[PDB]
Structure formats: structure tokens, C-alpha cells
Amino acid sequence: RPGQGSNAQFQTSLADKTRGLLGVGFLRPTKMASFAATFLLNFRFYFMYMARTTFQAVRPLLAFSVFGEVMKLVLATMSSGLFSFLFSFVLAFEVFYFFLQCYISYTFLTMFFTVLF
Amino acid sequence: IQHWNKSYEKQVYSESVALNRTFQARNQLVLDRLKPSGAYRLPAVDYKRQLSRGTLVEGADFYLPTAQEQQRLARHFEPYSEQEQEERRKFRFQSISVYLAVALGASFVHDYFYQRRPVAWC
Amino acid sequence: FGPTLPDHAYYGEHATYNYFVLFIRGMRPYLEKIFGDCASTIKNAAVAVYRP
Amino acid sequence: RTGGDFRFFPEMPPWQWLAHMENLRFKLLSVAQSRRSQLQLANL
Amino acid sequence: PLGVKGRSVFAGMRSFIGQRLGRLYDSFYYSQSSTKYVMVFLFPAGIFYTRFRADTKLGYHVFINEEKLYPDYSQNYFDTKWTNGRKVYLDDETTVEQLKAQIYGGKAAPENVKVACRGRVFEDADNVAMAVRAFCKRDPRLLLFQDNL
Amino acid sequence: SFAIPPANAAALADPLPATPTPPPVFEAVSSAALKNVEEVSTMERYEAAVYEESFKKPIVCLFFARFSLQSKVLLQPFLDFAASASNNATFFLIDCDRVPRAAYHARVENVPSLVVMKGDDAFRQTITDSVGVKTAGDLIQEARSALDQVLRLDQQEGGTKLQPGVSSYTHHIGVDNLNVYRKGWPVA
């Protein structure tokens, strides 16, 4: 026969075939445990990504709300005309800063919501 | 040193012999009995093998199900039948009336059947 | 002891002609039949109620 | 083992072929190692 | 041409389920031993056990007044020390005596030990579930103390 | 980044050229159409077969290649099996280098290969020797067994129970993407 020469070499021991039935060097429970450990440790990336996403979503809200409250405090406290004249320019700067943050959020959201497939 | 590293290699391959024998036994006992037939195999070929065969196609994220719809750009004379043309002529614009009616109905249902909430009484 | 696994065991399927999209394109007619029948039933009932 | 072309190279070989390969490796490494043991080290 | 004569939709369902199961067997066979057994048996089994136990049984946060009343857990492994606030899942038929024995490891408990919930002492021939329903509704935090008085 | 160059003149050349033939002395050695089969030369013919004849009555296809000696050994007993059982099935003879799209369709990876087909996926059984232990008689016995099995299964339950499977919706597009043209789908 063609393959009888090779298949004559394949004759095993009782202990050999018991060891193969149990799969000593081919199941590798230590490898299974290492895989489980690495897979569970890989859950930190989801937390990182959600933190980044929520920050980029609230960035314009912060720029619009807390600096707005600060400007509102200053408006409530100021009375004269010189300080108000100087504060108008701060308000315009805050406008530009808000639009900058909105552009940045647009950028980060198109980065974070782009999928290949 | 020579002695020791040579004998090290010797029983390295001894362990290799043991591994090969148990590998053979594992295979011919378990895996040749548990091997799948091949009827329910994967119905596709990897893109690398297709690329080497000269078989891979990349295009058409979309498709056209019907031949009537496939041959439209090749017919050049009747892209649409007359009946189809008059049927298409009914959708030159979106229907704001139907949008309004369906939206009002859905708002009514969502508000007065699904979003009912309790109120105090004095 | 060599490769025990084939290539398709690892490599991702075609991006545009994949298993699910081919499946649903094949199942399109039965789903069309189903939903057309259901919509026609509902529409006919509503019309039978609304006409009188 | 099979007079054939590289274009028909199987995806995964049989375990029989692998075991035969290991046996031939035994034969060759045995002979080469014992030759080295005798001649390569009596040099020095 | 949809459907064939002489064949039933139930036969077609059987066909499809057979196909799916054969494909699942093929994909499980041609997979990594390192990952597939874990991901297919040990995580599903643990998740099933945890969710079933939580969604079905009812558990209690247990506290002890004094360190002298703590059980001896030196010998049993994976818990060398008592910590207060342990969540303990019990059956509806459990009594205070059974709970005490479960806490103290089937060993000699101290004398005049009693259970309380929101300041209210439990009898020892009482069902824990009904006692909690009566005294501490939806606050099952139990406390073990010594009733010398 | 993975790429393969498109092709070469060698690859695109004729895979099956003629070679010199000896005089009638080299043939003298110690060891010294067919009216029952069909040699297939064209994927058009192969598709016609697979999509009509394999739905009418089963087919048995031998995929070979010239370099292989097992194919030469298996040819004659395959022809005898064809002469025996052509009443119940059709018999085809395919060269992998001449019609590769037929080999990609049947999912053959080694030669020689027997393929019993019915309904294009209702019964597909591939018989081969990837190891190198079986012989031609073993292969023909396995083919006879498979043909008996598929015939029995077609007779089973009033002609039904043999319906096409994944090809109902796949059209062999994951195996060979060129079927999108057959289906008329765009490629833009």
C-alpha cells in the first residue's frame, strides 16, 4: 500500500493514548487562564473611550455654562461704564472661544464616530 | 560542557518524541472520530486566496435585485415603462400633508396612551 | 506541530459581499411577501372601518 | 510524498505527514549529532 | 419560485436548524482551544449562575456587633477573616438557627446570640424571610449581637 | 498591507501545451469521449450541467490534472464505473487548469477528486486522498457508496428532502466573486 510504510510507525502505548485522550500538551489550561485574564484586563479601554466621549460631548456645554455664569457674576457686580466697556470685549472673546470649542467637539466626534466597515 | 549541552539536546528531543507520540494518539483517537464531514463548511474563500486566483471583486456596496432595474442604464430608450413613469410621477415631492397626519396621530397616541401620568386633585 | 487551523478560521469575511447581507438578500422575497400581506390586511381592515 | 505542484499545497498538512517528518528529523539529528560529538570536538 | 410542493415549512425549518447547528459545530471544531472552551462554557455558565441566583434567590447583608463574636475562618481557604456586610443568599424556608449555623460554620456559636434588623430582635424559631418582611421591609441588613442584658 | 501582482505571461499562457510523442519502442515496457462520460472544456458547459442536469439527475465529476499519476491510474476504473452507472447518473471529466472556476466551485484542493453532486448543494460529497493511503479502487468504492446514498435520499420522501442549501442565497459569491456578473449585480 502507499502509506503503510508511514502508518506502521504510528503505534502507541497505553499511557501514550491515555495522555492523548486527556490532552496534556494540547489543552493548556494555563493558556486558557492567561487568555481569560488578558480579556478581562482589556475592559479598561471601554472606560477610557467613554470618558473621552463624554468629555468631548460636554466641552461645549461647559464653555457655554460655567464661563457664562462667571460673565453673569461680573455683569451683576459691575455698575460703571469703563469696566463695562472693557468687559464687552471679554464677552466677544468668550463667543469666539465657544465657537472654537464647538469646532473642536465636531472634530473629535467625527473622529470618534468614523467606522471603516 | 559539551557533554552536558549534548545530553540536554538529547532529552529535549526525547520529550519531543513523547509529545509526538501523544499527538498521534490524540489525533487518531479523538480528532479523526470527531472531524466534521464538510457539508456545513464555510461557504466562502479568503480574500488572499481569491486575490491569488484572480477572482476577487471589491465593488458594489449596493445591488439591483431585478433585471428590469439592472438594465435601465443600458436600455437608453425605456429606462421606465409608461405605467412605471406615471407611477413615479406621483412622488415628485414629499407629502407634508401625510407627514402632518401621521405625526399628529403618533403624537396623540404616544401622549394619551403611552405617556399618561398622574396628577393631584384638590 | 504545524498549522492546525485554516486561514478562514482567522481572516475576516468579505467586506461588501458578506454572509448576513447575502442571506438577507436571499430572504428578501419571503419577507416582502410577509410584510406586504400584513400591511394589506391592516389597510383593508382600516378601510373597511373608515368607509362606512 | 505526492508528486504535485506548489499551487496545490494543502492549507494544513496531515498529522501522519507531520509525525513522519518528526521521525525523519530524529534520524537526521541523531546521525548529525553523533558525528559532531565524535569528530567536531576531538579537534579541540 | 418560492416553496416546493409536497414539502412543509416545518420541514424547511428543520432543514435550516440542522444547517445552523452543523455550521456551529464546524466553527467550534475549527477554533482555538485556548479561547473557545472558556468563551463558550465557563463565562456563559458563570454568568448564568450569577444572574439566576440574583434574579431568583434573595440575599441579606450580615453584620456582627463585636469582633469576639466573629466566626473562626482560619482553616477554610479563600476566606481567612470575617468582614461585615457580606451578602448572603438564602432560601425562603431558612430559619434563624440555620442562618446562625451557616455563619458559624456548623461549630459552637457563642451564648445568647441573637439577630436584629432595624433595632428589632428576632426569635430563633422564626423564618428569616417573613421576619424581614415584617420588621425591615426592603432593608434586609441583619445584625448579630450578644443578648446578655 | 498585502498585495499580489496581477499576472504574468507565463501564468496566462496555455496551461496544457503539447509535448513530443515517442515512437512505438518506448511504449514497449514490462507493464504494458469513451461513449459513457463527458469531457468538460468550458465553464458555460459546467454551469449548464450543475444548474440543470444536476437538478434533474445526479452527476459524478472527476477533477484531475496532467502532472498527477494518481489521476492516470484512476481514469480507467472511473471510466468503468461510468459505463456501469451512467443510467442513474451523468459523468463528467474536468481538468483543473483548463477549467479552474469549476474547481473553485466544487471546493477541490487536491487532485484526483471525485465529486458527487445533486441539486448543486442538496447532495455534495467530495472523495479524495489528502494523506496518500487510499487507492483507486477505494476511491471508486466510496464513489459508488455516495451515489447509492444520494439516489436513496432522492427516492426518500416523494422526491423531496433534496433541496439546495446555502447556494439558494449565496450564489457561490464568497467562493468565486465572479458570480456577481452572472447575477447581474453592479461592480462599480
Next chain:
Amino acid sequence: STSPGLAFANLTLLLDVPQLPAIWAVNAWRELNGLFTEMKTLAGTSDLLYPSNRYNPQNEKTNRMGRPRKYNHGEWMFGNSY
């Protein structure tokens, strides 16, 4: 495929879709327990059973809260004391 913006959905799916078998099993167990309770009620009981209650310890010698019944040592002309 995926992205950082889909971390919410990835985590939610990975953590919740494995729970669906257990959820369906819990629902089935509840339905079967209800079936057995209703079959017991149809068979008959000395004291009633509350169907939608967690635990029903009441019997001839036990209250509906797990305590012994008061005034249950003797017998009564009208039968059960409940």
C-alpha cells in the same frame, strides 16, 4: 465595525446579551412555579395560598407569617379557625 464612541454600546451588549438566556430561564421558572402553585390550589388547601407572594408558610399549625397559630390546641365547632 467599532469605534471609541461606541464604547457604551459595546460594553452594554457584551455585558447584557449573555444575560438573556438567564433572563428567559428565570421567566420560565417563574411561570412553572406559578403553574405548580395554581395546580396545588386547584387540588385544595387547608388555608389559602397567596399566588403572587414570595413565600406561603401557613398550614394547620402555622400562621401566614411563619409563627405558630394562636388558640389552635383544641377543636372548634365551625371547623378550621380560618
